[PDB]
């Protein structure tokens, strides 16, 4: 109620993973965010798992399961002991807590305007229509720019040239599955 002296100056001024895994542009912002802030393995792990649903299981294994992969993630003891749908399903299950925090942090920062490409996501989230097909095309085109941007300025992801490249290839692979390429 009480008037602010700088109120007129500023007048005109991701709930769950399942909700963002099909929206390329929004996922790129999260992906970008997680890559610069936390451990990229958990999230890349869940996105690739969901992509699995046979040869795309050896990839997943050498990238996330095997104790030596550049993108190793914590595996339940039981799984790491031993169906193929059971492990993947379980492996994912043990990433929830870690992916839950990353998501939460991303949602907080976004409210703070601290997450990447809010501008593009605003312009995108703005446009209206009932033409799903053409709306998705808009999402992809933006995602391309963002993905293109992630690939470029990414040497900052990690020192490990192999790590940062395992990250980029992991995101491209997944982006490719949603029709997004650079």
């Amino acid at each position: 109620s009480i008037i602010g002296a700088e109120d007129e100056d500023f007048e005109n001024e991701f709930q769950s993973l399942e909700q963002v895994k099909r929206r390329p542009a929004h996922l790129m912002a999260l992906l970008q965010h997680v890559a610069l802030q936390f451990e990229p393995g958990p999230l890349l792990c869940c996105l690739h798992a969901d992509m699995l649903g046979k040869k795309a299981f050896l990839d997943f294994y050498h990238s996330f399961l095997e104790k030596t992969a550049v993108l190793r993630v914590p595996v339940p003891p039981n799984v790491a002991f031993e169906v193929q749908r059971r492990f993947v399903q379980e492996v994912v299950q043990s990433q929830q807590v870690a992916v839950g925090r990353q998501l939460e942090d991303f949602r907080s920062k976004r409210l703070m305007g601290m997450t990447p490409w809010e501008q593009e996501l605003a312009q995108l989230e703005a446009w209206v229509g009932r033409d799903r097909a053409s709306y998705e095309a808009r999402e992809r085109h933006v995602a391309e720019r963002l993905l293109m941007h992630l690939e470029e300025m990414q040497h900052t992801i990690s020192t490990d040239e192999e790590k940062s490249a395992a990250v980029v290839n992991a995101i491209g692979l997944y982006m490719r599955h949603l029709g997004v390429r650079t």
Binding site: S1, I2, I3, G4, A5, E6, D7, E8, D9, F10, E13, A35, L36, Q37, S108, K109, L111, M112, G113, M114, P116, W117, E118, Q119, M153, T156, I157, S158
Partner: protein
């Protein structure tokens, strides 16, 4: 070969004021012309601030010191802050003089002084008081803002601004951005090839909430902005220096308000400036996931900033080495 310095921080943390000191200390400073450009802003500051004081007196139910002032209070809430000029935070001199009498009387009203003391309940810049206490010099028809008035003038920054200067053959590019949540969405457009980040924090706003939502604690917001920044890998090889600014305002505040009433995770004498500064330092240091430089500054004190920047300058250079 350019030294690129980022001025980051929440809204009203002293970013532009630090940049004006750079100009004063390592640049051409501000002459009568340059300073005379701030007058409209300073008059906008006074008028808009008094109007907040007047509106707060009414909404908080603070008795007038003198009921007759209800007339001026009204002549003040009548000012159209949405007119083209005032909306750009500019007020013409002759308009300013027309309201001076109503404003000067208002500032002397004990009830307006009471609203002021409770500013943490609404939104106001401490600088209005500085200017309100100096109406006799802003009243002069030939009023020209002193260097001190220029540093205190308040103008919300929007967008990205670069200021190139030099300090002995060394090339410096200083980037000034806006701190509101809406301005932050722009920060990412100036993150590359950065040498260092000077992170400003108003050490005195622990008893205040944000302008963006009137609910989030102002110190809490800085801690969180700092957290996202000090942990971005894009800055892993970039020195980050913390400036707990407005130290002068914190010295005054720790006497009348206890930070313990806002951060229960605090311990020690809340009315001891040293203990509060220790805590603030520990909170920011505690945000790092896994080399934290810090200084207690008062951006409006030219001599304070000169000493400090000399030290920051040798820090930003010896670190850029490895």
């Amino acid at each position: 070969r350019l030294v690129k310095i980022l001025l980051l921080g929440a809204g009203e943390s002293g970013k532009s004021t630090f940049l004006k000191q750079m100009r004063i200390i390592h640049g051409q400073d501000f002459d009568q012309r340059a300073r005379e450009e701030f007058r409209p802003t300073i008059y906008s500051n006074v008028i808009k601030g008094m109007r907040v004081l007047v509106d707060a007196r009414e909404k908080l139910h603070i008795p007038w010191g003198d009921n007759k002032n209800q007339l001026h209070g009204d002549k003040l809430m009548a000012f159209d802050t949405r007119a083209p000029m005032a909306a750009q935070g500019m007020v013409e001199t002759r308009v300013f003089l027309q309201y001076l009498p109503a404003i000067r009387a208002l500032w002397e009203d004990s009830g307006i002084q009471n609203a002021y003391d409770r500013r943490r309940e609404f939104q106001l810049g401490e600088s209005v008081k500085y200017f309100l206490d100096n109406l006799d010099k802003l009243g002069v028809p030939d009023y020209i803002p002193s260097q001190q008035d220029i540093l205190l003038a308040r103008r919300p920054t929007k967008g990205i601004h670069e200021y190139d200067f030099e300090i002995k053959n060394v090339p410096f590019k200083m980037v000034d951005v806006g701190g509101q949540r809406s301005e932050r969405k722009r920060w990412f457009e100036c993150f590359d090839s950065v040498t260092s980040i000077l992170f400003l924090v108003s050490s005195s706003e622990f008893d205040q909430v944000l302008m963006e939502d009137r609910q989030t604690n102002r110190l809490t917001e800085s801690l969180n902005i700092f957290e996202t920044i000090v942990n971005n890998r894009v800055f892993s090889n970039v020195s980050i220096i913390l400036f707990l600014n407005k130290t002068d305002l914190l010295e005054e505040k720790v006497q009348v308000v206890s930070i313990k009433d806002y951060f229960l995770e605090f311990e020690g004498d809340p009315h001891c400036l040293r203990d509060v500064q220790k805590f603030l330092v520990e909170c920011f240091r505690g945000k790092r996931r896994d080399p934290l430089y810090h200084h207690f500054t008062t951006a409006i004190n030219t001599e304070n900033i000169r000493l400090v920047f000399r030290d920051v300058k040798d820090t930003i250079l010896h670190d850029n080495l490895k």
